[PDB]
UniProtKB/TrEMBL annotation:
Family (UniProt): Belongs to the bacterial solute-binding protein 3 family.
The protein, known as: Arginine-binding protein
GO cellular component: membrane; outer membrane-bounded periplasmic space
Keyword check for Coiled coil: no
Residue spans crossing the bilayer: none
Domain Ionotropic glutamate receptor C-terminal: residue ranges: 3-225
A GO MF label: amino acid binding
Cystine crosslinks: 34-41
Residue stretches making up the Solute-binding protein family 3/N-terminal domain: 3-225
Keywords, comma-separated and alphabetical: Signal
Length: 225
């Protein structure tokens, strides 16, 4: 559709991040679909909480950036077909990037609410490579994270973000881990457009399918994953 404005908050590696240009897996997917569509595009970096309101007001045409498709979000916006698996977010101090793998988290302590699906996911995906500390609640896990007693926390992101905001901690940020274990697959990550924008949605879906078909998608995946 010749001109398309995308927005994200560039704070979620490896999906999106700051290279003063937005970079990352999602940024490359967006550039690739735009090329496929013969569209001219920009990616704007804006506060996470402003994105959906701005999409609804029509300031942007599309949102992306490690955005998990969820039933709740599907009530507010329309998503494309997913272009990668869903992400489990780890919350950690921004001063130290983490590689979210068995080797990258070697010697780290990860806090989690005990007995939850997040706890099971950590056990299955990391096994004995990490130390898991379990808490009665996400708040208790965060009390340890933000006093330096664990390295990262895994839990419900909207609740965690709410806690961090209420308690005036901007120091802690999210890192995305793609879920490769089919037992924990969700709908995936997708590009969001304004609810009812069927024309753009169809164009984006066709473009995503086309980059999958011509090898462009596979090369982008190989770059990051
Ligand atoms: N661009 C970003 N800051 N993305 C954060 C995404 C966090 C999480 N995956 C979610 O779907 O809510």
């Amino acid at each position: 559709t010749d001109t398309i404005k995308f927005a994200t908050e560039a704070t979620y590696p490896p999906y999106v991040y700051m290279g003063g240009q937005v970079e990352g897996f999602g940024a490359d997917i967006v550039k690739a679909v735009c090329k496929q569509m013969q569209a001219v595009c920009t990616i704007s970096n804006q506060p996470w909480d402003s994105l959906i309101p701005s999409l609804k007001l029509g300031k942007f045409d599309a949102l992306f950036g490690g955005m998990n498709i969820t039933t709740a979000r599907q009530k507010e916006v329309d998503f494309t077909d997913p272009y990668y698996t869903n992400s489990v977010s780890f919350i950690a101090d921004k001063n130290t990037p983490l590689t979210l793998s068995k080797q990258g988290l070697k010697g780290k302590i990860i806090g989690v609410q005990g007995g939850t699906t997040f706890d099971s996911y950590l056990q299955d995906s990391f096994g004995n490579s990490i130390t898991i500390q379990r808490y009665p609640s996400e708040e208790d896990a965060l009390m340890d994270l933000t006093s330096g007693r664990v390295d990262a926390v895994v839990g419900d992101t909207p609740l965690i973000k709410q806690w961090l905001k209420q308690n005036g901690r901007r120091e802690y940020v999210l890192i995305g881990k793609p879920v490769n274990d089919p037992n924990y697959f969700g709908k995936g990550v997708g590009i969001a457009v304004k609810k009812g924008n069927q024309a753009l949605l169809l164009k984006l879906n066709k473009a995503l399918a086309a980059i999958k078909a011509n090898g462009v998608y596979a090369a982008i995946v190989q770059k990051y994953f």
